């Protein structure tokens, strides 16, 4: 089975440790964890074939700039993910995390991730956003910030409901195979 290293980096609270908890081993439903802490492994069939993906979540703040480069040696693949319910999660995509993943991963792809998609037409989302004259992230967006950045590929999906979680992590493969 070929082995590949995914990385998945972006804002706090936009999604991410959610996401690689989905295809899990079991669950445990009322304890939060910022970040993933066992060893967590997607097995993906991509063209007839058998890939092992090491899953290492990070953590997004600030003070955790200084130790997050520790998880960056060898990997094969970027999830760099924003939230659809957090312009700012948006915007520090271009400002923040490529120019840190494009220095510590030089050449590995990058599949820009627009997280909690159900979160697009929910009412109290759109709410809170519009009383600060915002409104979610358009699709749209996405694929221009996918453009700005060179990102392999942009994707959305919702942890929540499930919707366009698993073609995150086979596009993930695919691109991790092409080097
Ligand atoms: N509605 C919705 N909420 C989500 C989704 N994914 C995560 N969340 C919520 O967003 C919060 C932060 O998620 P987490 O995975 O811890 O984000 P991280 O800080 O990027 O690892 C938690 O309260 C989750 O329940 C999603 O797809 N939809
Ligand atoms: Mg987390």
Same mark, same amino acid.
């Given at each position: 089975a070929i082995r590949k290293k995914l990385v998945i980096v972006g804002d706090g609270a936009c999604g991410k440790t959610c996401l690689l908890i989905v295809n899990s081993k079991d669950q445990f439903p009322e304890v939060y964890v910022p970040t993933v802490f066992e060893n967590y492994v997607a097995d993906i069939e991509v063209d007839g074939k058998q890939v092992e993906? &090491?899953?290492? #979540? $990070? &953590?997004? @703040?600030?003070?955790?700039? !200084?130790?997050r480069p520790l998880s960056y040696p #060898?990997?094969?693949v970027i999830l760099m993910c924003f939230s659809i319910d957090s312009p700012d999660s948006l915007e520090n995509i271009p400002? /923040?995390?490529?120019? %840190?993943?494009?220095?510590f991963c030089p050449n590995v792809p990058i599949i820009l991730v627009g997280n909690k998609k159900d979160l !697009?037409?929910? %009412?109290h989302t759109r709410r809170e956003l519009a009383k600060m004259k @915002?409104?979610?992230?358009?699709?749209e967006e996405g694929r221009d910030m996918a453009n700005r950045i060179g990102a392999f590929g942009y994707m959305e999906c919702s942890a929540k $409901? /499930?919707?366009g979680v698993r073609e995150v992590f086979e596009m993930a493969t695919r691109a991790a195979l092409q080097a």
């Open positions: 993906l &090491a899953l290492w #979540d $990070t &953590a997004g @703040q600030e003070d955790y700039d !200084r130790l #060898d990997t094969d400002e /923040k995390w490529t120019p %840190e993943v494009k220095h !697009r037409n929910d %009412e @915002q409104e979610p992230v358009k699709p $409901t /499930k919707d």
